[PDB]
Design a protein around this ligand. Sequence first.
Ligand SMILES: *C(=C)CNC(=O)[C@H](CC(C)C)N[C@@H](c1ccc(-c2ccc(S(C)(=O)=O)cc2)cc1)C(F)(F)F
Ligand SMILES: *C(=C)CNC(=O)[C@H](CC(C)C)N[C@@H](c1ccc(-c2ccc(S(C)(=O)=O)cc2)cc1)C(F)(F)F
Ligand SMILES: [Ca+2]
Ligand SMILES: [Cl-]
Ligand SMILES: [Cl-]
Lengths: 215, 215
Amino acid sequence: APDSVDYRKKGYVTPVKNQGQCGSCWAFSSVGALEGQLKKKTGKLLNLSPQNLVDCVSENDGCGGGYMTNAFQYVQKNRGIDSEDAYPYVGQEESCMYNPTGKAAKCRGYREIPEGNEKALKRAVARVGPVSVAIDASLTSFQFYSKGVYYDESCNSDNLNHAVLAVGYGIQKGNKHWIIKNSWGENWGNKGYILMARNKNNACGIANLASFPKM
Amino acid sequence: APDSVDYRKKGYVTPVKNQGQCGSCWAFSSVGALEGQLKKKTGKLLNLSPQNLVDCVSENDGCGGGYMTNAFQYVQKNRGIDSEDAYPYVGQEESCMYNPTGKAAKCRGYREIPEGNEKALKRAVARVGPVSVAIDASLTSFQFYSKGVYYDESCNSDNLNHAVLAVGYGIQKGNKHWIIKNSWGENWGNKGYILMARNKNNACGIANLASFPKM
Ligand SMILES: *C(=C)CNC(=O)[C@H](CC(C)C)N[C@@H](c1ccc(-c2ccc(S(C)(=O)=O)cc2)cc1)C(F)(F)F
Ligand SMILES: *C(=C)CNC(=O)[C@H](CC(C)C)N[C@@H](c1ccc(-c2ccc(S(C)(=O)=O)cc2)cc1)C(F)(F)F
Ligand SMILES: [Ca+2]
Ligand SMILES: [Cl-]
Ligand SMILES: [Cl-]
Protein backbone atom coordinates (compact mmCIF):
# COMPACT_ATOMS: atom_id res chain seq x y z
CA ALA A 1 0.00 0.00 0.00
CA PRO A 2 1.40 3.54 -0.32
CA ASP A 3 3.56 4.97 2.45
CA SER A 4 0.94 7.68 3.20
CA VAL A 5 -2.82 8.07 2.34
CA ASP A 6 -5.10 10.94 3.17
CA TYR A 7 -8.66 10.72 1.92
CA ARG A 8 -9.41 14.34 2.86
CA LYS A 9 -7.38 15.19 -0.24
CA LYS A 10 -9.55 13.00 -2.45
CA GLY A 11 -12.79 14.57 -1.26
CA TYR A 12 -14.12 11.52 0.61
CA VAL A 13 -14.56 13.25 3.95
CA THR A 14 -17.30 15.70 5.12
CA PRO A 15 -16.68 18.56 7.60
CA VAL A 16 -16.09 17.57 11.26
CA LYS A 17 -19.37 17.37 13.25
CA ASN A 18 -20.22 17.77 16.89
CA GLN A 19 -22.18 15.00 18.56
CA GLY A 20 -22.84 17.36 21.47
CA GLN A 21 -24.23 15.78 24.70
CA CYS A 22 -25.44 12.56 23.00
CA GLY A 23 -23.22 9.39 23.08
CA SER A 24 -23.67 9.13 19.30
CA CYS A 25 -19.96 8.79 18.28
CA TRP A 26 -20.90 5.36 16.80
CA ALA A 27 -23.42 7.02 14.53
CA PHE A 28 -21.01 9.71 13.30
CA SER A 29 -18.31 7.06 12.76
CA SER A 30 -20.78 4.92 10.77
CA VAL A 31 -22.00 7.78 8.65
CA GLY A 32 -18.38 8.86 7.95
CA ALA A 33 -17.60 5.50 6.60
CA LEU A 34 -20.74 5.35 4.51
CA GLU A 35 -20.13 8.88 3.15
CA GLY A 36 -16.61 7.75 2.02
CA GLN A 37 -17.97 4.73 0.15
CA LEU A 38 -20.73 6.82 -1.47
CA LYS A 39 -18.08 9.31 -2.77
CA LYS A 40 -16.00 6.42 -4.08
CA LYS A 41 -18.97 4.78 -5.85
CA THR A 42 -20.79 7.79 -7.28
CA GLY A 43 -18.39 10.70 -7.29
CA LYS A 44 -20.59 12.69 -4.95
CA LEU A 45 -19.82 13.67 -1.29
CA LEU A 46 -22.99 14.18 0.79
CA ASN A 47 -23.74 14.46 4.56
CA LEU A 48 -25.72 11.43 5.67
CA SER A 49 -27.92 11.30 8.81
CA PRO A 50 -26.40 10.23 12.16
CA GLN A 51 -29.87 11.10 13.77
CA ASN A 52 -31.47 8.47 11.56
CA LEU A 53 -29.16 5.89 13.08
CA VAL A 54 -29.53 7.27 16.60
CA ASP A 55 -33.35 6.97 16.48
CA CYS A 56 -33.72 3.83 14.38
CA VAL A 57 -30.95 1.29 15.13
CA SER A 58 -32.83 -0.74 17.68
CA GLU A 59 -29.73 -2.96 18.36
CA ASN A 60 -27.93 0.11 19.70
CA ASP A 61 -28.88 2.31 22.63
CA GLY A 62 -29.25 5.63 20.93
CA CYS A 63 -27.52 8.39 22.90
CA GLY A 64 -26.58 5.76 25.38
CA GLY A 65 -24.05 4.25 23.01
CA GLY A 66 -23.66 1.61 20.42
CA TYR A 67 -21.58 -0.08 17.67
CA MET A 68 -20.96 0.73 14.09
CA THR A 69 -21.60 -2.84 12.91
CA ASN A 70 -25.18 -2.70 14.19
CA ALA A 71 -25.64 0.58 12.28
CA PHE A 72 -24.44 -0.90 8.93
CA GLN A 73 -26.74 -3.85 9.51
CA TYR A 74 -29.76 -1.49 10.04
CA VAL A 75 -28.99 0.42 6.82
CA GLN A 76 -28.72 -2.93 4.98
CA LYS A 77 -32.02 -4.27 6.47
CA ASN A 78 -33.79 -0.87 6.20
CA ARG A 79 -32.77 -0.71 2.46
CA GLY A 80 -31.41 2.79 3.07
CA ILE A 81 -30.27 5.74 5.12
CA ASP A 82 -31.42 9.31 4.81
CA SER A 83 -29.34 12.39 4.03
CA GLU A 84 -28.73 14.81 6.90
CA ASP A 85 -30.98 17.23 5.01
CA ALA A 86 -33.96 14.83 5.17
CA TYR A 87 -33.31 13.76 8.80
CA PRO A 88 -31.39 16.44 10.73
CA TYR A 89 -29.22 16.00 13.74
CA VAL A 90 -30.81 17.15 17.01
CA GLY A 91 -28.64 15.58 19.70
CA GLN A 92 -31.35 13.66 21.52
CA GLU A 93 -32.97 10.32 20.77
CA GLU A 94 -36.47 10.65 19.35
CA SER A 95 -38.88 8.26 17.72
CA CYS A 96 -37.92 6.75 14.43
CA MET A 97 -38.87 9.11 11.60
CA TYR A 98 -37.11 7.50 8.65
CA ASN A 99 -38.24 8.97 5.37
CA PRO A 100 -37.79 6.66 2.38
CA THR A 101 -38.08 9.63 0.04
CA GLY A 102 -34.86 11.07 1.44
CA LYS A 103 -32.70 7.92 1.19
CA ALA A 104 -29.34 8.84 -0.11
CA ALA A 105 -27.19 5.74 0.39
CA LYS A 106 -27.64 1.92 0.92
CA CYS A 107 -25.47 -0.82 2.45
CA ARG A 108 -24.91 -4.42 1.23
CA GLY A 109 -23.11 -5.59 4.38
CA TYR A 110 -19.85 -4.85 6.09
CA ARG A 111 -16.36 -6.17 6.40
CA GLU A 112 -14.26 -6.33 9.52
CA ILE A 113 -10.54 -5.89 9.77
CA PRO A 114 -8.62 -8.75 11.37
CA GLU A 115 -8.61 -8.06 15.12
CA GLY A 116 -5.58 -6.12 16.31
CA ASN A 117 -3.80 -6.10 12.95
CA GLU A 118 -2.60 -2.58 12.07
CA LYS A 119 -0.95 -3.83 8.82
CA ALA A 120 -4.38 -5.10 7.79
CA LEU A 121 -6.03 -1.83 8.85
CA LYS A 122 -3.42 0.12 6.82
CA ARG A 123 -4.16 -1.98 3.68
CA ALA A 124 -7.89 -1.53 4.24
CA VAL A 125 -7.64 2.28 4.46
CA ALA A 126 -5.52 2.39 1.36
CA ARG A 127 -7.78 -0.02 -0.61
CA VAL A 128 -11.26 1.08 0.61
CA GLY A 129 -11.33 4.63 1.90
CA PRO A 130 -12.20 5.80 5.44
CA VAL A 131 -12.76 3.02 7.94
CA SER A 132 -14.75 3.12 11.22
CA VAL A 133 -12.66 2.46 14.27
CA ALA A 134 -12.98 2.14 17.98
CA ILE A 135 -10.50 3.40 20.55
CA ASP A 136 -9.84 4.13 24.15
CA ALA A 137 -10.53 7.93 24.24
CA SER A 138 -10.87 7.72 28.03
CA LEU A 139 -7.47 9.13 29.13
CA THR A 140 -7.44 12.85 30.09
CA SER A 141 -4.57 13.30 27.68
CA PHE A 142 -6.84 12.38 24.71
CA GLN A 143 -9.55 14.70 25.92
CA PHE A 144 -7.09 17.60 26.03
CA TYR A 145 -5.19 16.46 22.95
CA SER A 146 -4.07 19.44 20.91
CA LYS A 147 -1.48 18.69 18.17
CA GLY A 148 1.23 16.12 17.36
CA VAL A 149 1.26 12.32 17.12
CA TYR A 150 -0.80 11.31 20.13
CA TYR A 151 0.72 8.56 22.17
CA ASP A 152 0.22 7.76 25.87
CA GLU A 153 1.58 4.61 27.71
CA SER A 154 -1.62 4.56 29.75
CA CYS A 155 -4.03 3.85 26.90
CA ASN A 156 -5.83 0.54 27.36
CA SER A 157 -6.11 -1.39 24.19
CA ASP A 158 -9.12 -3.16 25.66
CA ASN A 159 -11.23 -0.35 27.15
CA LEU A 160 -12.74 0.63 23.83
CA ASN A 161 -15.20 3.41 24.49
CA HIS A 162 -15.31 5.78 21.62
CA ALA A 163 -15.94 5.47 17.84
CA VAL A 164 -14.12 7.62 15.25
CA LEU A 165 -13.11 7.46 11.60
CA ALA A 166 -9.63 6.58 10.21
CA VAL A 167 -9.34 8.71 7.03
CA GLY A 168 -5.65 8.07 6.32
CA TYR A 169 -2.20 7.35 7.70
CA GLY A 170 1.34 8.70 7.38
CA ILE A 171 4.29 9.94 9.35
CA GLN A 172 5.10 13.21 11.14
CA LYS A 173 8.55 14.04 12.59
CA GLY A 174 9.53 10.36 12.41
CA ASN A 175 6.37 9.16 14.08
CA LYS A 176 3.96 6.96 12.06
CA HIS A 177 0.32 7.87 12.67
CA TRP A 178 -3.32 7.39 11.81
CA ILE A 179 -5.35 10.46 10.72
CA ILE A 180 -8.49 10.25 12.85
CA LYS A 181 -11.68 12.33 12.44
CA ASN A 182 -13.47 12.78 15.71
CA SER A 183 -17.04 13.96 16.32
CA TRP A 184 -16.24 16.57 19.04
CA GLY A 185 -16.54 19.65 16.87
CA GLU A 186 -13.88 21.63 15.05
CA ASN A 187 -12.63 23.28 18.29
CA TRP A 188 -11.35 20.01 19.66
CA GLY A 189 -7.87 18.78 18.85
CA ASN A 190 -6.44 19.80 15.51
CA LYS A 191 -9.62 21.33 14.06
CA GLY A 192 -11.50 18.24 15.14
CA TYR A 193 -8.80 15.82 14.09
CA ILE A 194 -6.18 13.76 15.86
CA LEU A 195 -3.07 11.98 14.64
CA MET A 196 -2.77 8.79 16.68
CA ALA A 197 0.37 6.61 16.93
CA ARG A 198 0.68 3.79 14.39
CA ASN A 199 2.58 0.46 14.69
CA LYS A 200 3.16 1.26 18.38
CA ASN A 201 1.57 -1.96 19.61
CA ASN A 202 -1.95 -1.12 18.62
CA ALA A 203 -1.96 2.01 20.74
CA CYS A 204 -5.44 2.79 22.09
CA GLY A 205 -6.85 -0.39 20.51
CA ILE A 206 -7.18 1.35 17.16
CA ALA A 207 -7.21 -1.95 15.23
CA ASN A 208 -9.43 -3.96 17.53
CA LEU A 209 -12.88 -3.13 16.19
CA ALA A 210 -12.47 -1.67 12.74
CA SER A 211 -15.07 -2.15 10.02
CA PHE A 212 -16.37 -0.64 6.86
CA PRO A 213 -19.55 -0.91 4.89
CA LYS A 214 -20.07 -2.68 1.57
CA MET A 215 -21.93 -0.95 -1.28
CA ALA B 1 -53.28 -17.09 21.88
CA PRO B 2 -53.98 -20.28 23.91
CA ASP B 3 -54.10 -20.15 27.76
CA SER B 4 -51.20 -22.51 28.19
CA VAL B 5 -48.35 -23.83 25.95
CA ASP B 6 -45.34 -26.09 26.56
CA TYR B 7 -42.96 -26.94 23.81
CA ARG B 8 -41.16 -29.60 25.90
CA LYS B 9 -44.29 -31.77 25.38
CA LYS B 10 -44.24 -31.26 21.55
CA GLY B 11 -40.62 -32.34 21.09
CA TYR B 12 -39.28 -28.88 20.28
CA VAL B 13 -36.67 -28.51 23.10
CA THR B 14 -33.35 -30.37 23.37
CA PRO B 15 -31.86 -31.44 26.69
CA VAL B 16 -30.63 -28.91 29.21
CA LYS B 17 -27.02 -27.85 28.80
CA ASN B 18 -24.33 -26.48 30.98
CA GLN B 19 -22.28 -23.49 29.82
CA GLY B 20 -19.56 -24.18 32.34
CA GLN B 21 -17.23 -21.32 33.29
CA CYS B 22 -17.83 -19.45 30.10
CA GLY B 23 -20.35 -16.62 29.81
CA SER B 24 -21.95 -18.03 26.71
CA CYS B 25 -25.61 -17.90 27.94
CA TRP B 26 -26.37 -15.84 24.84
CA ALA B 27 -25.20 -18.64 22.65
CA PHE B 28 -27.27 -21.33 24.34
CA SER B 29 -30.29 -19.00 24.23
CA SER B 30 -29.74 -18.33 20.48
CA VAL B 31 -29.25 -21.96 19.63
CA GLY B 32 -32.41 -23.00 21.63
CA ALA B 33 -34.56 -20.58 19.62
CA LEU B 34 -32.96 -21.87 16.38
CA GLU B 35 -33.55 -25.53 17.45
CA GLY B 36 -37.28 -24.83 17.90
CA GLN B 37 -37.67 -23.31 14.47
CA LEU B 38 -35.64 -26.09 12.87
CA LYS B 39 -38.06 -28.72 14.40
CA LYS B 40 -41.06 -26.80 13.07
CA LYS B 41 -39.55 -26.50 9.60
CA THR B 42 -38.09 -30.02 9.11
CA GLY B 43 -39.77 -32.08 11.80
CA LYS B 44 -36.32 -32.96 13.18
CA LEU B 45 -35.02 -32.01 16.72
CA LEU B 46 -31.26 -31.95 16.98
CA ASN B 47 -28.55 -30.12 18.98
CA LEU B 48 -27.07 -27.00 17.28
CA SER B 49 -23.61 -25.61 18.13
CA PRO B 50 -23.34 -22.80 20.71
CA GLN B 51 -19.48 -23.07 20.32
CA ASN B 52 -19.77 -22.20 16.61
CA LEU B 53 -21.38 -18.94 17.92
CA VAL B 54 -18.88 -18.20 20.73
CA ASP B 55 -15.97 -18.62 18.36
CA CYS B 56 -17.42 -17.12 15.19
CA VAL B 57 -19.81 -14.29 16.21
CA SER B 58 -17.30 -11.43 15.92
CA GLU B 59 -19.95 -8.88 17.05
CA ASN B 60 -20.07 -10.55 20.45
CA ASP B 61 -17.32 -11.16 22.96
CA GLY B 62 -17.15 -14.95 23.19
CA CYS B 63 -17.05 -16.06 26.83
CA GLY B 64 -17.21 -12.40 27.86
CA GLY B 65 -20.85 -11.98 26.80
CA GLY B 66 -22.97 -11.11 23.84
CA TYR B 67 -26.38 -10.62 22.40
CA MET B 68 -28.73 -12.87 20.67
CA THR B 69 -29.54 -10.66 17.72
CA ASN B 70 -25.88 -10.69 16.75
CA ALA B 71 -26.07 -14.37 16.73
CA PHE B 72 -29.01 -14.66 14.40
CA GLN B 73 -27.32 -12.09 12.11
CA TYR B 74 -24.18 -14.18 11.98
CA VAL B 75 -26.18 -17.33 10.99
CA GLN B 76 -27.86 -15.26 8.32
CA LYS B 77 -24.64 -13.73 6.93
CA ASN B 78 -22.73 -17.05 7.15
CA ARG B 79 -25.47 -19.11 5.35
CA GLY B 80 -25.53 -21.60 8.21
CA ILE B 81 -24.79 -22.81 11.71
CA ASP B 82 -23.24 -26.19 12.47
CA SER B 83 -24.66 -29.08 14.48
CA GLU B 84 -23.14 -29.77 17.95
CA ASP B 85 -21.65 -32.99 16.69
CA ALA B 86 -19.81 -31.10 13.87
CA TYR B 87 -18.64 -28.33 16.33
CA PRO B 88 -18.66 -29.50 20.01
CA TYR B 89 -18.83 -27.35 23.07
CA VAL B 90 -15.50 -26.74 24.80
CA GLY B 91 -16.28 -23.88 27.13
CA GLN B 92 -13.50 -21.55 26.17
CA GLU B 93 -13.32 -19.23 23.17
CA GLU B 94 -11.21 -20.51 20.27
CA SER B 95 -10.69 -19.47 16.68
CA CYS B 96 -13.45 -19.98 14.12
CA MET B 97 -13.69 -23.53 12.86
CA TYR B 98 -16.97 -23.36 11.02
CA ASN B 99 -17.48 -26.25 8.66
CA PRO B 100 -20.02 -25.91 5.77
CA THR B 101 -20.25 -29.74 5.51
CA GLY B 102 -21.68 -29.81 9.04
CA LYS B 103 -24.40 -27.21 8.40
CA ALA B 104 -27.62 -28.12 10.20
CA ALA B 105 -29.75 -24.95 9.97
CA LYS B 106 -30.09 -21.60 8.23
CA CYS B 107 -31.62 -18.25 9.28
CA ARG B 108 -33.26 -15.50 7.25
CA GLY B 109 -33.16 -12.76 9.87
CA TYR B 110 -34.81 -12.09 13.16
CA ARG B 111 -37.70 -10.38 14.86
CA GLU B 112 -37.57 -8.41 18.06
CA ILE B 113 -40.34 -8.37 20.57
CA PRO B 114 -41.39 -4.79 21.48
CA GLU B 115 -39.81 -3.70 24.71
CA GLY B 116 -41.58 -4.73 27.83
CA ASN B 117 -44.51 -6.25 25.99
CA GLU B 118 -45.49 -9.52 27.70
CA LYS B 119 -48.51 -9.93 25.63
CA ALA B 120 -46.41 -9.85 22.51
CA LEU B 121 -43.87 -12.35 24.02
CA LYS B 122 -46.87 -14.54 24.91
CA ARG B 123 -48.19 -14.49 21.34
CA ALA B 124 -44.76 -15.19 19.88
CA VAL B 125 -44.21 -18.20 22.13
CA ALA B 126 -47.60 -19.52 21.06
CA ARG B 127 -47.38 -19.05 17.33
CA VAL B 128 -43.72 -19.07 16.50
CA GLY B 129 -42.08 -21.29 19.14
CA PRO B 130 -39.41 -20.89 21.83
CA VAL B 131 -38.17 -17.28 22.21
CA SER B 132 -34.80 -16.03 23.36
CA VAL B 133 -35.19 -13.60 26.30
CA ALA B 134 -32.86 -11.61 28.56
CA ILE B 135 -33.34 -11.25 32.36
CA ASP B 136 -31.82 -10.11 35.50
CA ALA B 137 -30.46 -13.36 36.98
CA SER B 138 -28.27 -11.57 39.52
CA LEU B 139 -30.11 -12.24 42.74
CA THR B 140 -29.36 -15.06 45.18
CA SER B 141 -33.05 -16.03 45.12
CA PHE B 142 -32.78 -16.77 41.38
CA GLN B 143 -29.57 -18.76 41.92
CA PHE B 144 -31.24 -20.89 44.55
CA TYR B 145 -34.63 -21.32 42.95
CA SER B 146 -36.19 -24.89 43.29
CA LYS B 147 -39.97 -24.88 42.64
CA GLY B 148 -43.02 -22.63 42.30
CA VAL B 149 -43.34 -19.43 40.38
CA TYR B 150 -40.30 -17.21 40.76
CA TYR B 151 -41.04 -13.66 41.68
CA ASP B 152 -38.75 -11.12 43.37
CA GLU B 153 -39.12 -7.37 43.66
CA SER B 154 -35.43 -6.60 43.74
CA CYS B 155 -35.04 -8.13 40.33
CA ASN B 156 -34.00 -5.07 38.27
CA SER B 157 -35.62 -5.10 34.79
CA ASP B 158 -33.03 -2.45 33.82
CA ASN B 159 -30.12 -4.73 34.76
CA LEU B 160 -30.23 -7.38 32.11
CA ASN B 161 -27.39 -9.85 32.43
CA HIS B 162 -28.33 -13.35 31.47
CA ALA B 163 -29.95 -14.93 28.42
CA VAL B 164 -32.39 -17.84 28.61
CA LEU B 165 -35.08 -19.48 26.57
CA ALA B 166 -38.89 -19.01 27.04
CA VAL B 167 -40.30 -22.44 26.08
CA GLY B 168 -43.87 -21.99 27.16
CA TYR B 169 -46.21 -20.38 29.60
CA GLY B 170 -49.07 -21.25 31.82
CA ILE B 171 -50.34 -21.05 35.33
CA GLN B 172 -49.55 -22.80 38.60
CA LYS B 173 -51.99 -22.45 41.51
CA GLY B 174 -53.30 -19.09 40.22
CA ASN B 175 -49.83 -17.73 39.37
CA LYS B 176 -49.23 -17.11 35.76
CA HIS B 177 -45.71 -17.89 34.60
CA TRP B 178 -43.20 -18.26 31.88
CA ILE B 179 -41.54 -21.68 31.43
CA ILE B 180 -37.83 -20.93 31.09
CA LYS B 181 -34.92 -23.24 30.03
CA ASN B 182 -31.56 -22.17 31.57
CA SER B 183 -27.94 -23.15 30.56
CA TRP B 184 -26.66 -23.88 34.22
CA GLY B 185 -26.89 -27.65 34.00
CA GLU B 186 -29.59 -30.20 34.79
CA ASN B 187 -29.31 -29.70 38.60
CA TRP B 188 -29.96 -25.97 38.94
CA GLY B 189 -33.56 -24.95 39.55
CA ASN B 190 -36.04 -27.60 38.57
CA LYS B 191 -34.07 -30.01 36.41
CA GLY B 192 -32.56 -27.00 34.65
CA TYR B 193 -35.84 -25.03 34.32
CA ILE B 194 -37.35 -22.07 36.29
CA LEU B 195 -41.04 -20.82 36.19
CA MET B 196 -40.85 -17.06 36.19
CA ALA B 197 -43.69 -14.67 37.07
CA ARG B 198 -45.84 -13.70 34.02
CA ASN B 199 -48.01 -10.58 33.77
CA LYS B 200 -46.43 -9.24 36.99
CA ASN B 201 -45.08 -5.94 35.60
CA ASN B 202 -42.33 -7.48 33.43
CA ALA B 203 -40.62 -9.20 36.30
CA CYS B 204 -36.86 -9.68 35.80
CA GLY B 205 -37.24 -7.75 32.62
CA ILE B 206 -38.42 -10.94 30.75
CA ALA B 207 -39.90 -9.02 27.83
CA ASN B 208 -37.19 -6.22 27.57
CA LEU B 209 -34.85 -7.82 24.96
CA ALA B 210 -36.65 -10.89 23.57
CA SER B 211 -36.23 -11.99 19.92
CA PHE B 212 -36.46 -15.00 17.69
CA PRO B 213 -35.08 -16.15 14.45
CA LYS B 214 -36.79 -16.35 11.05
CA MET B 215 -36.37 -19.60 9.08
C1 LIG C 1 -19.77 7.66 21.85
C2 LIG C 1 -19.70 9.05 22.12
C3 LIG C 1 -20.02 6.76 22.86
N1 LIG C 1 -19.35 5.48 22.76
C4 LIG C 1 -19.97 4.37 22.30
O1 LIG C 1 -21.16 4.35 21.91
C5 LIG C 1 -19.10 3.14 22.27
C6 LIG C 1 -18.55 2.96 20.90
C7 LIG C 1 -17.84 1.67 20.70
C8 LIG C 1 -16.68 1.41 21.60
C9 LIG C 1 -17.39 1.59 19.19
N2 LIG C 1 -19.86 1.92 22.63
C10 LIG C 1 -20.38 1.95 24.03
C11 LIG C 1 -21.74 1.25 24.14
C12 LIG C 1 -22.77 1.70 24.97
C13 LIG C 1 -24.00 1.05 25.00
C14 LIG C 1 -24.23 -0.06 24.20
C15 LIG C 1 -25.57 -0.72 24.16
C16 LIG C 1 -25.95 -1.51 23.08
C17 LIG C 1 -27.16 -2.20 23.09
C18 LIG C 1 -27.99 -2.11 24.20
S1 LIG C 1 -29.56 -2.92 24.17
C19 LIG C 1 -29.28 -4.39 23.28
O2 LIG C 1 -29.90 -3.26 25.52
O3 LIG C 1 -30.46 -2.11 23.42
C20 LIG C 1 -27.63 -1.34 25.29
C21 LIG C 1 -26.42 -0.64 25.26
C22 LIG C 1 -23.19 -0.50 23.36
C23 LIG C 1 -21.96 0.16 23.35
C24 LIG C 1 -19.31 1.26 24.92
F1 LIG C 1 -19.80 1.20 26.21
F2 LIG C 1 -18.22 1.91 24.93
F3 LIG C 1 -19.15 0.00 24.62
C1 LIG D 1 -24.24 -15.18 30.08
C2 LIG D 1 -23.89 -16.18 30.87
C3 LIG D 1 -23.70 -13.87 30.07
N1 LIG D 1 -24.53 -12.76 29.74
C4 LIG D 1 -24.56 -12.18 28.53
O1 LIG D 1 -23.86 -12.54 27.58
C5 LIG D 1 -25.51 -11.01 28.46
C6 LIG D 1 -26.74 -11.51 27.82
C7 LIG D 1 -27.74 -10.46 27.44
C8 LIG D 1 -28.32 -9.71 28.69
C9 LIG D 1 -28.82 -11.14 26.58
N2 LIG D 1 -24.94 -9.88 27.70
C10 LIG D 1 -23.80 -9.16 28.31
C11 LIG D 1 -22.83 -8.69 27.26
C12 LIG D 1 -21.46 -8.63 27.57
C13 LIG D 1 -20.56 -8.20 26.62
C14 LIG D 1 -21.00 -7.86 25.36
C15 LIG D 1 -20.03 -7.39 24.33
C16 LIG D 1 -20.36 -7.46 22.98
C17 LIG D 1 -19.42 -7.09 22.01
C18 LIG D 1 -18.17 -6.64 22.40
S1 LIG D 1 -17.00 -6.19 21.16
C19 LIG D 1 -17.91 -5.30 20.00
O2 LIG D 1 -16.05 -5.29 21.75
O3 LIG D 1 -16.52 -7.39 20.53
C20 LIG D 1 -17.83 -6.58 23.73
C21 LIG D 1 -18.76 -6.96 24.69
C22 LIG D 1 -22.36 -7.93 25.07
C23 LIG D 1 -23.26 -8.33 26.01
C24 LIG D 1 -24.30 -7.98 29.14
F1 LIG D 1 -23.32 -7.35 29.71
F2 LIG D 1 -25.17 -8.36 30.09
F3 LIG D 1 -24.97 -7.11 28.44
CA1 LIG E 1 -25.66 -6.76 15.19
CL1 LIG F 1 4.11 0.90 7.80
CL1 LIG G 1 -52.58 -13.86 29.91
